[PDB]
Structures are given as C-alpha cells and as structure tokens.
mmCIF file of C-alpha atoms and ligand atoms in Angstrom:
data_model
loop_
_atom_site.group_PDB
_atom_site.id
_atom_site.type_symbol
_atom_site.label_atom_id
_atom_site.label_comp_id
_atom_site.label_asym_id
_atom_site.label_seq_id
_atom_site.Cartn_x
_atom_site.Cartn_y
_atom_site.Cartn_z
ATOM 1 C CA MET N 172 -21.879 -8.700 -7.465
ATOM 2 C CA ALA N 173 -19.014 -7.642 -9.839
ATOM 3 C CA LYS N 174 -21.056 -8.695 -12.955
ATOM 4 C CA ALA N 175 -23.966 -6.349 -11.956
ATOM 5 C CA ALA N 176 -21.516 -3.435 -11.410
ATOM 6 C CA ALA N 177 -20.265 -0.882 -13.949
ATOM 7 C CA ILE N 178 -17.999 2.224 -13.860
ATOM 8 C CA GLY N 179 -17.949 5.442 -15.854
ATOM 9 C CA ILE N 180 -14.586 6.723 -17.036
ATOM 10 C CA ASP N 181 -13.767 10.178 -18.399
ATOM 11 C CA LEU N 182 -10.524 9.465 -20.347
ATOM 12 C CA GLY N 183 -9.315 13.078 -20.649
ATOM 13 C CA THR N 184 -6.466 14.648 -22.584
ATOM 14 C CA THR N 185 -4.675 15.877 -19.407
ATOM 15 C CA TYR N 186 -6.698 14.278 -16.519
ATOM 16 C CA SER N 187 -8.964 11.207 -16.155
ATOM 17 C CA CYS N 188 -11.810 10.624 -13.686
ATOM 18 C CA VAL N 189 -13.751 7.483 -12.614
ATOM 19 C CA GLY N 190 -17.208 7.262 -11.028
ATOM 20 C CA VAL N 191 -19.630 4.580 -9.849
ATOM 21 C CA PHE N 192 -23.425 4.849 -9.467
ATOM 22 C CA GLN N 193 -24.631 2.884 -6.410
ATOM 23 C CA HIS N 194 -27.277 3.250 -3.694
ATOM 24 C CA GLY N 195 -28.933 6.126 -5.626
ATOM 25 C CA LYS N 196 -25.822 8.322 -5.885
ATOM 26 C CA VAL N 197 -22.697 8.858 -7.964
ATOM 27 C CA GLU N 198 -19.425 8.470 -6.117
ATOM 28 C CA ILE N 199 -16.446 10.023 -7.883
ATOM 29 C CA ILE N 200 -13.636 7.768 -6.715
ATOM 30 C CA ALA N 201 -10.490 9.257 -5.126
ATOM 31 C CA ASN N 202 -7.154 7.673 -6.124
ATOM 32 C CA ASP N 203 -4.492 6.455 -3.591
ATOM 33 C CA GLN N 204 -3.218 10.091 -3.130
ATOM 34 C CA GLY N 205 -6.818 11.233 -2.318
ATOM 35 C CA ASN N 206 -7.315 12.984 -5.713
ATOM 36 C CA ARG N 207 -10.692 12.772 -7.495
ATOM 37 C CA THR N 208 -8.952 13.218 -10.914
ATOM 38 C CA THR N 209 -5.743 11.499 -12.070
ATOM 39 C CA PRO N 210 -3.203 12.942 -14.588
ATOM 40 C CA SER N 211 -3.352 11.106 -18.022
ATOM 41 C CA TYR N 212 0.455 10.543 -17.772
ATOM 42 C CA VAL N 213 2.564 7.443 -18.102
ATOM 43 C CA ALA N 214 6.280 7.522 -17.080
ATOM 44 C CA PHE N 215 8.895 4.892 -18.004
ATOM 45 C CA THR N 216 11.835 4.816 -15.595
ATOM 46 C CA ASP N 217 14.998 2.737 -14.944
ATOM 47 C CA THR N 218 12.964 0.473 -12.541
ATOM 48 C CA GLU N 219 9.247 0.936 -13.144
ATOM 49 C CA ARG N 220 6.310 2.254 -15.055
ATOM 50 C CA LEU N 221 4.419 5.104 -13.285
ATOM 51 C CA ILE N 222 0.838 6.187 -14.035
ATOM 52 C CA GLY N 223 -0.969 9.342 -12.901
ATOM 53 C CA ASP N 224 0.249 11.589 -10.077
ATOM 54 C CA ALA N 225 3.575 9.748 -9.612
ATOM 55 C CA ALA N 226 4.200 10.072 -13.408
ATOM 56 C CA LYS N 227 3.283 13.812 -13.481
ATOM 57 C CA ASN N 228 5.415 14.444 -10.322
ATOM 58 C CA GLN N 229 8.696 13.337 -12.035
ATOM 59 C CA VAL N 230 8.050 14.872 -15.527
ATOM 60 C CA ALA N 231 10.873 17.498 -15.048
ATOM 61 C CA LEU N 232 13.512 14.865 -14.196
ATOM 62 C CA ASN N 233 12.519 12.429 -16.997
ATOM 63 C CA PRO N 234 10.839 14.408 -19.885
ATOM 64 C CA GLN N 235 11.885 12.075 -22.769
ATOM 65 C CA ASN N 236 10.224 9.042 -21.147
ATOM 66 C CA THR N 237 7.102 10.701 -19.634
ATOM 67 C CA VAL N 238 4.190 10.282 -22.071
ATOM 68 C CA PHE N 239 1.088 12.541 -22.020
ATOM 69 C CA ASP N 240 -1.382 13.806 -24.769
ATOM 70 C CA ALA N 241 -1.903 10.249 -26.143
ATOM 71 C CA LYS N 242 -5.557 11.281 -26.786
ATOM 72 C CA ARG N 243 -4.189 13.713 -29.484
ATOM 73 C CA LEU N 244 -2.671 10.706 -31.327
ATOM 74 C CA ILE N 245 -5.307 7.980 -30.681
ATOM 75 C CA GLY N 246 -7.012 6.702 -33.864
ATOM 76 C CA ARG N 247 -4.882 8.922 -36.147
ATOM 77 C CA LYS N 248 -2.467 8.152 -39.000
ATOM 78 C CA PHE N 249 1.205 9.279 -38.653
ATOM 79 C CA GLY N 250 0.837 11.428 -41.815
ATOM 80 C CA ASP N 251 -2.171 13.308 -40.326
ATOM 81 C CA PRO N 252 -1.202 17.081 -40.215
ATOM 82 C CA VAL N 253 -2.570 17.201 -36.571
ATOM 83 C CA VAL N 254 0.044 14.541 -35.579
ATOM 84 C CA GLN N 255 2.881 16.207 -37.561
ATOM 85 C CA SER N 256 2.123 19.601 -35.967
ATOM 86 C CA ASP N 257 1.771 18.262 -32.364
ATOM 87 C CA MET N 258 5.018 16.145 -32.560
ATOM 88 C CA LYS N 259 7.114 19.357 -32.711
ATOM 89 C CA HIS N 260 5.945 20.257 -29.144
ATOM 90 C CA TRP N 261 6.407 16.948 -27.300
ATOM 91 C CA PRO N 262 9.666 16.001 -25.471
ATOM 92 C CA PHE N 263 9.016 12.271 -26.163
ATOM 93 C CA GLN N 264 9.721 10.581 -29.525
ATOM 94 C CA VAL N 265 6.862 9.704 -31.948
ATOM 95 C CA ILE N 266 7.781 7.129 -34.641
ATOM 96 C CA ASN N 267 6.013 5.773 -37.703
ATOM 97 C CA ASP N 268 4.984 2.057 -37.813
ATOM 98 C CA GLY N 269 3.227 1.515 -41.224
ATOM 99 C CA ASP N 270 1.460 4.972 -41.162
ATOM 100 C CA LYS N 271 0.538 4.414 -37.451
ATOM 101 C CA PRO N 272 2.207 6.547 -34.732
ATOM 102 C CA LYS N 273 3.973 4.855 -31.785
ATOM 103 C CA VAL N 274 5.510 6.692 -28.817
ATOM 104 C CA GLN N 275 9.141 5.551 -28.350
ATOM 105 C CA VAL N 276 10.745 5.593 -24.870
ATOM 106 C CA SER N 277 13.487 4.100 -22.726
ATOM 107 C CA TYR N 278 12.101 1.623 -20.117
ATOM 108 C CA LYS N 279 14.276 -0.444 -17.718
ATOM 109 C CA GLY N 280 17.271 0.521 -19.920
ATOM 110 C CA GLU N 281 15.656 -0.789 -23.149
ATOM 111 C CA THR N 282 14.056 1.012 -26.133
ATOM 112 C CA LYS N 283 10.297 0.246 -26.270
ATOM 113 C CA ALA N 284 7.567 1.690 -28.513
ATOM 114 C CA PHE N 285 3.806 1.891 -27.764
ATOM 115 C CA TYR N 286 0.660 2.504 -29.769
ATOM 116 C CA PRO N 287 -1.452 5.440 -28.430
ATOM 117 C CA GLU N 288 -4.139 2.866 -27.429
ATOM 118 C CA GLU N 289 -1.511 0.980 -25.377
ATOM 119 C CA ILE N 290 -0.621 4.237 -23.568
ATOM 120 C CA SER N 291 -4.310 5.054 -22.990
ATOM 121 C CA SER N 292 -4.892 1.433 -21.805
ATOM 122 C CA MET N 293 -2.314 2.018 -18.975
ATOM 123 C CA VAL N 294 -4.285 5.125 -17.908
ATOM 124 C CA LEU N 295 -7.556 3.067 -18.101
ATOM 125 C CA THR N 296 -5.957 0.163 -16.106
ATOM 126 C CA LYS N 297 -5.132 2.702 -13.314
ATOM 127 C CA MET N 298 -8.762 4.045 -13.319
ATOM 128 C CA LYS N 299 -10.021 0.418 -13.166
ATOM 129 C CA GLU N 300 -7.676 -0.334 -10.161
ATOM 130 C CA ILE N 301 -8.758 2.924 -8.408
ATOM 131 C CA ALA N 302 -12.445 1.729 -8.710
ATOM 132 C CA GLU N 303 -11.517 -1.834 -7.577
ATOM 133 C CA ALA N 304 -9.696 -0.491 -4.411
ATOM 134 C CA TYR N 305 -12.787 1.631 -3.554
ATOM 135 C CA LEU N 306 -15.351 -1.155 -4.247
ATOM 136 C CA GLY N 307 -13.414 -4.066 -2.721
ATOM 137 C CA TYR N 308 -13.992 -6.282 -5.790
ATOM 138 C CA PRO N 309 -12.910 -6.183 -9.502
ATOM 139 C CA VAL N 310 -15.242 -4.233 -11.776
ATOM 140 C CA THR N 311 -14.809 -4.794 -15.484
ATOM 141 C CA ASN N 312 -17.931 -3.251 -17.188
ATOM 142 C CA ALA N 313 -17.342 0.388 -18.190
ATOM 143 C CA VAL N 314 -18.704 3.329 -20.147
ATOM 144 C CA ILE N 315 -15.809 5.356 -21.641
ATOM 145 C CA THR N 316 -16.304 8.903 -22.972
ATOM 146 C CA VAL N 317 -14.807 10.625 -26.074
ATOM 147 C CA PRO N 318 -15.132 14.168 -27.574
ATOM 148 C CA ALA N 319 -18.269 14.624 -29.716
ATOM 149 C CA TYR N 320 -16.044 15.282 -32.825
ATOM 150 C CA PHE N 321 -14.149 11.943 -32.552
ATOM 151 C CA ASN N 322 -14.640 9.917 -35.805
ATOM 152 C CA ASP N 323 -15.071 6.093 -36.047
ATOM 153 C CA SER N 324 -11.325 5.305 -36.034
ATOM 154 C CA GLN N 325 -10.764 7.368 -32.798
ATOM 155 C CA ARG N 326 -13.823 5.765 -31.123
ATOM 156 C CA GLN N 327 -12.614 2.248 -32.135
ATOM 157 C CA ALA N 328 -9.034 2.890 -30.857
ATOM 158 C CA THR N 329 -10.514 4.161 -27.535
ATOM 159 C CA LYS N 330 -12.650 0.934 -27.245
ATOM 160 C CA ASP N 331 -9.401 -1.041 -28.072
ATOM 161 C CA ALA N 332 -7.656 0.825 -25.187
ATOM 162 C CA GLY N 333 -10.535 -0.359 -22.944
ATOM 163 C CA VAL N 334 -10.154 -4.041 -24.072
ATOM 164 C CA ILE N 335 -6.329 -3.969 -23.563
ATOM 165 C CA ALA N 336 -7.011 -2.546 -20.033
ATOM 166 C CA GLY N 337 -9.327 -5.551 -19.215
ATOM 167 C CA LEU N 338 -12.541 -3.595 -19.412
ATOM 168 C CA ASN N 339 -15.789 -4.731 -21.074
ATOM 169 C CA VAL N 340 -16.765 -1.513 -22.920
ATOM 170 C CA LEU N 341 -20.560 -1.219 -22.598
ATOM 171 C CA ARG N 342 -20.542 1.890 -24.812
ATOM 172 C CA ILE N 343 -18.377 4.732 -26.083
ATOM 173 C CA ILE N 344 -20.410 7.911 -25.350
ATOM 174 C CA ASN N 345 -19.782 11.605 -26.205
ATOM 175 C CA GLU N 346 -18.413 13.797 -23.400
ATOM 176 C CA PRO N 347 -21.117 16.571 -23.766
ATOM 177 C CA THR N 348 -23.835 13.849 -23.772
ATOM 178 C CA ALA N 349 -22.375 12.384 -20.479
ATOM 179 C CA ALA N 350 -22.364 15.969 -19.025
ATOM 180 C CA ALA N 351 -26.086 16.505 -20.016
ATOM 181 C CA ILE N 352 -26.926 13.087 -18.439
ATOM 182 C CA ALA N 353 -25.108 14.199 -15.210
ATOM 183 C CA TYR N 354 -27.577 17.126 -14.957
ATOM 184 C CA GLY N 355 -30.553 14.867 -15.888
ATOM 185 C CA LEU N 356 -31.263 16.986 -18.989
ATOM 186 C CA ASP N 357 -32.573 13.935 -20.937
ATOM 187 C CA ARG N 358 -35.385 13.332 -18.334
ATOM 188 C CA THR N 359 -37.426 16.588 -18.801
ATOM 189 C CA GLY N 360 -40.297 14.692 -20.553
ATOM 190 C CA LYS N 361 -41.332 15.554 -24.153
ATOM 191 C CA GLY N 362 -40.236 18.322 -26.562
ATOM 192 C CA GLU N 363 -36.827 19.238 -28.076
ATOM 193 C CA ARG N 364 -34.319 20.542 -25.472
ATOM 194 C CA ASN N 365 -31.293 22.560 -26.747
ATOM 195 C CA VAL N 366 -28.213 22.240 -24.532
ATOM 196 C CA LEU N 367 -24.902 24.025 -24.835
ATOM 197 C CA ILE N 368 -21.875 22.384 -23.145
ATOM 198 C CA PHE N 369 -18.940 24.799 -22.476
ATOM 199 C CA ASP N 370 -15.912 22.580 -21.789
ATOM 200 C CA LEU N 371 -12.662 24.404 -20.825
ATOM 201 C CA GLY N 372 -10.064 21.855 -19.596
ATOM 202 C CA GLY N 373 -6.280 21.865 -19.025
ATOM 203 C CA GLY N 374 -5.267 21.872 -22.693
ATOM 204 C CA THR N 375 -8.426 21.956 -24.869
ATOM 205 C CA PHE N 376 -11.618 24.001 -25.237
ATOM 206 C CA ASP N 377 -14.802 22.457 -26.661
ATOM 207 C CA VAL N 378 -18.221 23.923 -27.251
ATOM 208 C CA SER N 379 -20.989 21.441 -28.075
ATOM 209 C CA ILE N 380 -24.648 22.029 -28.872
ATOM 210 C CA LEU N 381 -27.042 19.077 -28.406
ATOM 211 C CA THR N 382 -30.776 18.645 -28.983
ATOM 212 C CA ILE N 383 -32.508 16.161 -26.623
ATOM 213 C CA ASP N 384 -35.792 14.993 -28.171
ATOM 214 C CA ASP N 385 -37.578 12.492 -25.862
ATOM 215 C CA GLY N 386 -34.367 10.971 -24.457
ATOM 216 C CA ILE N 387 -32.672 10.823 -27.904
ATOM 217 C CA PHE N 388 -29.474 12.932 -28.178
ATOM 218 C CA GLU N 389 -28.413 14.683 -31.396
ATOM 219 C CA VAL N 390 -25.155 16.672 -31.860
ATOM 220 C CA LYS N 391 -26.034 19.909 -33.731
ATOM 221 C CA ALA N 392 -22.612 21.570 -33.571
ATOM 222 C CA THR N 393 -19.090 21.279 -32.239
ATOM 223 C CA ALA N 394 -16.619 24.164 -32.071
ATOM 224 C CA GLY N 395 -13.615 25.198 -30.050
ATOM 225 C CA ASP N 396 -9.845 25.330 -29.845
ATOM 226 C CA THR N 397 -7.856 22.119 -29.398
ATOM 227 C CA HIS N 398 -4.892 24.142 -28.081
ATOM 228 C CA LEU N 399 -6.602 26.404 -25.491
ATOM 229 C CA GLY N 400 -6.852 25.491 -21.848
ATOM 230 C CA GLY N 401 -5.877 26.047 -18.233
ATOM 231 C CA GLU N 402 -2.157 25.588 -18.984
ATOM 232 C CA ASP N 403 -2.171 28.756 -21.188
ATOM 233 C CA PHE N 404 -3.416 30.716 -18.115
ATOM 234 C CA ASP N 405 -0.616 29.190 -15.931
ATOM 235 C CA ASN N 406 1.876 30.340 -18.618
ATOM 236 C CA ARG N 407 0.497 33.935 -18.618
ATOM 237 C CA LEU N 408 1.076 34.001 -14.800
ATOM 238 C CA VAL N 409 4.612 32.603 -15.302
ATOM 239 C CA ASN N 410 5.539 35.449 -17.772
ATOM 240 C CA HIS N 411 4.206 38.067 -15.297
ATOM 241 C CA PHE N 412 6.261 36.669 -12.374
ATOM 242 C CA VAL N 413 9.391 36.315 -14.596
ATOM 243 C CA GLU N 414 9.020 40.102 -15.405
ATOM 244 C CA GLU N 415 8.371 40.951 -11.695
ATOM 245 C CA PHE N 416 11.496 38.958 -10.586
ATOM 246 C CA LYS N 417 13.493 40.912 -13.239
ATOM 247 C CA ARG N 418 12.121 44.278 -11.900
ATOM 248 C CA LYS N 419 12.932 43.421 -8.229
ATOM 249 C CA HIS N 420 16.338 41.697 -8.708
ATOM 250 C CA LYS N 421 17.609 42.650 -12.228
ATOM 251 C CA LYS N 422 17.974 38.885 -13.044
ATOM 252 C CA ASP N 423 16.362 36.904 -15.918
ATOM 253 C CA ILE N 424 15.161 33.473 -14.622
ATOM 254 C CA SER N 425 13.523 32.282 -17.963
ATOM 255 C CA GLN N 426 16.586 30.132 -18.899
ATOM 256 C CA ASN N 427 16.729 28.238 -15.546
ATOM 257 C CA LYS N 428 14.508 25.193 -16.325
ATOM 258 C CA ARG N 429 14.106 24.311 -12.587
ATOM 259 C CA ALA N 430 13.194 27.920 -11.620
ATOM 260 C CA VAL N 431 10.606 28.114 -14.457
ATOM 261 C CA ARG N 432 8.987 24.701 -13.524
ATOM 262 C CA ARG N 433 8.770 25.554 -9.762
ATOM 263 C CA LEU N 434 7.258 28.944 -10.701
ATOM 264 C CA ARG N 435 4.840 27.156 -13.122
ATOM 265 C CA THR N 436 3.468 24.698 -10.497
ATOM 266 C CA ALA N 437 3.181 27.570 -7.916
ATOM 267 C CA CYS N 438 1.284 29.641 -10.574
ATOM 268 C CA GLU N 439 -1.163 26.751 -11.278
ATOM 269 C CA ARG N 440 -1.833 26.552 -7.484
ATOM 270 C CA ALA N 441 -2.267 30.370 -7.132
ATOM 271 C CA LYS N 442 -4.605 30.337 -10.179
ATOM 272 C CA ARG N 443 -6.875 27.793 -8.388
ATOM 273 C CA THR N 444 -6.915 29.989 -5.181
ATOM 274 C CA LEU N 445 -7.929 32.985 -7.349
ATOM 275 C CA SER N 446 -11.189 31.136 -8.209
ATOM 276 C CA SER N 447 -12.360 31.462 -4.517
ATOM 277 C CA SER N 448 -10.177 34.361 -3.086
ATOM 278 C CA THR N 449 -9.469 37.895 -4.536
ATOM 279 C CA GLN N 450 -5.705 37.364 -3.967
ATOM 280 C CA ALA N 451 -3.204 34.479 -3.813
ATOM 281 C CA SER N 452 0.285 34.284 -2.397
ATOM 282 C CA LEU N 453 3.384 32.666 -3.964
ATOM 283 C CA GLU N 454 5.926 31.324 -1.413
ATOM 284 C CA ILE N 455 8.980 29.950 -3.272
ATOM 285 C CA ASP N 456 12.104 29.352 -1.169
ATOM 286 C CA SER N 457 15.358 29.954 -3.113
ATOM 287 C CA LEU N 458 13.703 30.340 -6.579
ATOM 288 C CA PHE N 459 16.912 31.483 -8.321
ATOM 289 C CA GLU N 460 20.458 32.147 -7.021
ATOM 290 C CA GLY N 461 19.274 31.668 -3.383
ATOM 291 C CA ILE N 462 16.614 34.397 -3.715
ATOM 292 C CA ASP N 463 13.228 33.668 -2.132
ATOM 293 C CA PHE N 464 10.173 34.719 -4.164
ATOM 294 C CA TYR N 465 7.432 35.694 -1.716
ATOM 295 C CA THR N 466 4.821 37.717 -3.525
ATOM 296 C CA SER N 467 1.071 37.932 -4.284
ATOM 297 C CA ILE N 468 -1.324 38.730 -7.118
ATOM 298 C CA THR N 469 -4.916 39.957 -7.215
ATOM 299 C CA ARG N 470 -7.721 38.217 -9.164
ATOM 300 C CA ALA N 471 -7.993 41.622 -11.080
ATOM 301 C CA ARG N 472 -4.361 41.345 -12.300
ATOM 302 C CA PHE N 473 -4.833 37.620 -13.226
ATOM 303 C CA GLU N 474 -7.975 38.576 -15.207
ATOM 304 C CA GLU N 475 -5.934 41.271 -17.053
ATOM 305 C CA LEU N 476 -3.081 38.790 -17.799
ATOM 306 C CA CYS N 477 -5.577 36.294 -19.482
ATOM 307 C CA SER N 478 -8.151 38.880 -20.711
ATOM 308 C CA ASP N 479 -7.688 38.145 -24.499
ATOM 309 C CA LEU N 480 -7.771 34.314 -23.856
ATOM 310 C CA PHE N 481 -10.980 34.475 -21.718
ATOM 311 C CA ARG N 482 -12.666 36.683 -24.377
ATOM 312 C CA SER N 483 -11.575 34.274 -27.194
ATOM 313 C CA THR N 484 -13.784 31.500 -25.653
ATOM 314 C CA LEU N 485 -16.917 33.369 -26.949
ATOM 315 C CA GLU N 486 -15.978 33.093 -30.724
ATOM 316 C CA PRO N 487 -16.481 29.222 -30.761
ATOM 317 C CA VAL N 488 -19.749 29.772 -28.776
ATOM 318 C CA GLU N 489 -21.094 32.095 -31.508
ATOM 319 C CA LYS N 490 -19.686 29.810 -34.262
ATOM 320 C CA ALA N 491 -21.472 26.761 -32.694
ATOM 321 C CA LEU N 492 -24.774 28.741 -32.498
ATOM 322 C CA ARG N 493 -24.544 29.728 -36.239
ATOM 323 C CA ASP N 494 -23.603 26.116 -37.270
ATOM 324 C CA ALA N 495 -26.562 24.766 -35.182
ATOM 325 C CA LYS N 496 -28.756 27.567 -36.716
ATOM 326 C CA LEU N 497 -29.919 28.622 -33.215
ATOM 327 C CA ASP N 498 -30.080 32.040 -31.557
ATOM 328 C CA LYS N 499 -28.997 32.474 -27.871
ATOM 329 C CA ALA N 500 -32.623 32.541 -26.551
ATOM 330 C CA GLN N 501 -33.235 29.097 -28.282
ATOM 331 C CA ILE N 502 -30.690 27.396 -25.904
ATOM 332 C CA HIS N 503 -32.529 25.875 -22.900
ATOM 333 C CA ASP N 504 -29.482 24.853 -20.758
ATOM 334 C CA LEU N 505 -25.857 25.925 -20.287
ATOM 335 C CA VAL N 506 -23.515 23.279 -18.793
ATOM 336 C CA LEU N 507 -19.922 23.898 -17.443
ATOM 337 C CA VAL N 508 -17.263 21.155 -17.918
ATOM 338 C CA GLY N 509 -13.502 21.308 -17.182
ATOM 339 C CA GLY N 510 -11.696 22.687 -14.130
ATOM 340 C CA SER N 511 -10.979 26.058 -15.842
ATOM 341 C CA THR N 512 -14.758 26.883 -15.866
ATOM 342 C CA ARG N 513 -14.414 27.523 -12.082
ATOM 343 C CA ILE N 514 -12.691 30.836 -13.032
ATOM 344 C CA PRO N 515 -15.236 33.587 -12.084
ATOM 345 C CA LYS N 516 -14.328 35.843 -15.086
ATOM 346 C CA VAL N 517 -15.023 32.920 -17.496
ATOM 347 C CA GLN N 518 -18.472 32.293 -15.870
ATOM 348 C CA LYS N 519 -19.274 36.037 -15.997
ATOM 349 C CA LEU N 520 -18.312 36.286 -19.739
ATOM 350 C CA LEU N 521 -20.454 33.241 -20.659
ATOM 351 C CA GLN N 522 -23.452 34.347 -18.478
ATOM 352 C CA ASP N 523 -23.331 37.935 -19.923
ATOM 353 C CA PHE N 524 -23.067 36.514 -23.494
ATOM 354 C CA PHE N 525 -26.263 34.491 -22.721
ATOM 355 C CA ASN N 526 -27.940 37.693 -21.413
ATOM 356 C CA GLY N 527 -27.612 37.008 -17.627
ATOM 357 C CA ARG N 528 -28.607 33.298 -17.785
ATOM 358 C CA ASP N 529 -28.029 30.761 -14.923
ATOM 359 C CA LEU N 530 -25.244 28.214 -15.504
ATOM 360 C CA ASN N 531 -25.370 24.475 -14.600
ATOM 361 C CA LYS N 532 -22.245 24.251 -12.408
ATOM 362 C CA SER N 533 -23.272 22.486 -9.137
ATOM 363 C CA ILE N 534 -21.401 19.294 -10.161
ATOM 364 C CA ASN N 535 -17.544 19.616 -9.987
ATOM 365 C CA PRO N 536 -16.901 20.560 -13.653
ATOM 366 C CA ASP N 537 -13.789 18.356 -13.861
ATOM 367 C CA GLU N 538 -16.059 15.448 -12.645
ATOM 368 C CA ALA N 539 -19.396 16.013 -14.558
ATOM 369 C CA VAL N 540 -18.390 13.798 -17.541
ATOM 370 C CA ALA N 541 -17.377 10.798 -15.320
ATOM 371 C CA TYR N 542 -20.551 11.458 -13.273
ATOM 372 C CA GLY N 543 -22.809 11.083 -16.359
ATOM 373 C CA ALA N 544 -20.778 8.137 -17.727
ATOM 374 C CA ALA N 545 -21.293 6.407 -14.287
ATOM 375 C CA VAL N 546 -25.094 7.056 -14.524
ATOM 376 C CA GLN N 547 -25.160 5.633 -18.096
ATOM 377 C CA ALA N 548 -22.967 2.619 -17.123
ATOM 378 C CA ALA N 549 -25.535 1.781 -14.343
ATOM 379 C CA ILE N 550 -28.541 2.014 -16.727
ATOM 380 C CA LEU N 551 -26.691 -0.099 -19.371
ATOM 381 C CA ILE N 552 -25.516 -2.879 -16.951
ATOM 382 C CA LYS N 553 -29.098 -3.054 -15.426
ATOM 383 C CA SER N 554 -30.608 -3.524 -18.959
ATOM 384 C CA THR N 555 -27.968 -6.277 -19.663
ATOM 385 C CA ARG N 556 -29.022 -7.998 -16.329
HETATM 386 N N1 LIG J 728 -10.318 26.110 -8.913
HETATM 387 C C1 LIG J 728 -9.872 26.158 -10.174
HETATM 388 N N2 LIG J 728 -9.717 27.368 -10.754
HETATM 389 C C2 LIG J 728 -9.131 27.440 -11.954
HETATM 390 N N3 LIG J 728 -8.646 26.449 -12.706
HETATM 391 C C3 LIG J 728 -8.852 25.255 -12.125
HETATM 392 C C4 LIG J 728 -9.450 25.027 -10.900
HETATM 393 N N4 LIG J 728 -9.493 23.671 -10.614
HETATM 394 C C5 LIG J 728 -8.916 23.129 -11.647
HETATM 395 CL CL1 LIG J 728 -8.727 21.440 -11.845
HETATM 396 N N5 LIG J 728 -8.491 24.008 -12.603
HETATM 397 C C6 LIG J 728 -7.771 23.764 -13.842
HETATM 398 O O1 LIG J 728 -8.556 22.912 -14.652
HETATM 399 C C7 LIG J 728 -7.696 22.129 -15.508
HETATM 400 C C8 LIG J 728 -8.106 20.677 -15.443
HETATM 401 O O2 LIG J 728 -9.456 20.504 -15.882
HETATM 402 C C9 LIG J 728 -6.259 22.468 -15.099
HETATM 403 O O3 LIG J 728 -5.784 23.469 -15.998
HETATM 404 C C10 LIG J 728 -6.431 23.053 -13.691
HETATM 405 O O4 LIG J 728 -5.445 24.024 -13.371
#
C-alpha cells in the first residue's frame, strides 16, 4: 500500500514540484490551489506559518519574515563568499551559529532562527502533504533532486531536510539526470549517449552535459549563471512600463513599493502570455495616484527588452561543450527544463546554435525533473520490495 509507494520531489530554488508514478504514468500532483508547482517560500506570521502559494501571496506585507532562496544557503558555511554576497539582497536576517547560517525571523511575536535544512524541510513537508491528499494515504518514500554541481555537504543537508520532513530518502539524484530519465534517454540500448540539459528557471540558469553509457550516467560538464532567470525578464518588463507610465503621465512610480509590486506580478503574467500569443495586455486599476494602467506589449518588444539576457544563455552552452570536450554535432539530445524555456526566442536561439536541431520539450519544463524523480522513485521502491 503506502510502503510500496514512492514520490519524486523537485526541491527547486524558487518553485517545488511533486510527482507519483502509478498505473504506467506519471501524475504531477496539483496542490490545494490547483497549481502543479508550489513556491519554495515559508512565511512566519503573528498567528501561523505559511508554505507555498499563501506564503508567496503575502511577501509584500511581511518581507522580513518571508523566507525564500534557502537552497542558496543549504549545506554552506556562513563564511562562504556565496552566502556573504547573497545576504546583501535578502529582506530576511541571516545569522551565524558556529560558522553555520540560520535564517532569523519573528514568529507568533517571538524571535526564532532556522537552519536552511529546517526551512527546506517545511517546503518538503508541504510536498509530502500535497501527495498524501492526492493519494488518500501517507507516502513517505521519496527521491529528492539536487543540482549536478551540489557537493557532498549540500547533498547531505538536502537528505537531512528530507528526514526532518518525515520522508525516507531513497536517493538524492541530480536534476539533469532526472530530466534525462523523464525523456527515457537512459533506455536507448547500448553505446554512449551525450545529452545536454538547458535549465532556465525563475532565478538560476544551468547547463549540464551528461553521457549515458548503458544506463550509467556520467556528468561531463556543468556551466551556467546562478543569478539568471525568469525574474530578470519580469524586471526588464517592469523598467519598460515604468518609463511608459512616465511618458504618458509625467510621473515616476519607481519609489511606490505597492505600484512596483503590482506592476511586477502583472509583468510576470504578461510574460507567460507572450509565450503563446504575439501580444499581452496589462489591466491595472488605479496603479498610481488613481491612474489606471491599461496597456499592451508585443512579443517583439519583449524580445528586444531581454535580447542581451537571452543571448547570454549561449556562453555557458559553449563553455560546457569545451569543458566536456565535445563539439555541437556530438550531442545526441537537447532537453528543456525550467518554465522560462517556454519563451519562443530562447528555444529559437538554442535550436539555431545547435544548427536547427529538435528540442525535447513535450514534458512541461517546470515539471520534467519531478517527472523523472517520480520514475526513479518507482524503480527504487520496486527493487526494495
Ligand atoms: N509560459 C511561460 N513563459 C515564460 N516564462 C514562464 C512560463 N511559465 C513559467 Cl512557470 N515561466 C517562468 O518560469 C519560472 C519558473 O520556472 C518563472 O520565472 C516563471 O515566470
């Protein structure tokens, strides 16, 4: 029953996703708000602890006590220059407990501090409860994914987050490996198969090259930008609309925190529409000083606004190829991961770089990692019996 069942969890930097393999198919499980992905956010309020959508929804009202980006801290020392650099950009406090970072917040009127693995365990607990509500019984066996560049300390702290969350961690697997499993790229028989995984998420960009030799995976190269993602494209749209509001009304809105956040969420929404329509409309009632902001933008203008950022995704692709010592024509498969890979200009740039090649994109790119983890979790629990 529950003991013969296992879930696959993509514990992402900005969003998490949970899947289950049963009756010959993967089911990506929708949360209680009907969303197939859940924000990796934890909010501490005057009455409760919120996780996911409810935590992301109140981030503007409670920024000091709304934790996100715990994956950037997990398994790291406080003194790590990555930690010291990131801390300058977070609205929540990060403290030092014997060279280990802890996030410090106010919860039910009291000061509390949490290890990154404790924060990530609250996200994992939510993914576990989402699966349990769908299945109708508690599932505890799980495969959890991590970036291919995570070291032993980061992998161990992720497994620790799983244990705190009440999960039996069958295995910690690499995200690009889970994505290749989702597409069944390890079941092509004999001979070395070179796979490139292009992973453009909400806040990070990762390029991974893998060789699959008779089911055995080997990481040949990892490249990317830890601070490039979908949110940079939302911000380019924001700056455009701030300049357009200034041209129409001769008013600078950039200082009004509420006006900027409402414009930001509307921009994120319009950006998504631009992946399937050639124009998107913004409809913001009383954006600033009672002035409605009803406008539109073409996909052509959006592509111009992010042109330099889209083009920059090809330097880590080339860098990964040189590190792996492979030419473009030596790559057998191209896999898309992360919601931002739905952007047509991004697909066109990657396809043209690989000389007109087909892309593996039929699985929802923000779900492919949880899909493969769910497949692996089923194989692993079946072998355990
Ligand atoms: N249809 C889409 N077109 C463009 N960007 C998208 C789309 N869907 C998502 Cl999710 N994202 C973005 O992916 C990230 C999460 O993986 C977020 O930045 C989200 O906006």
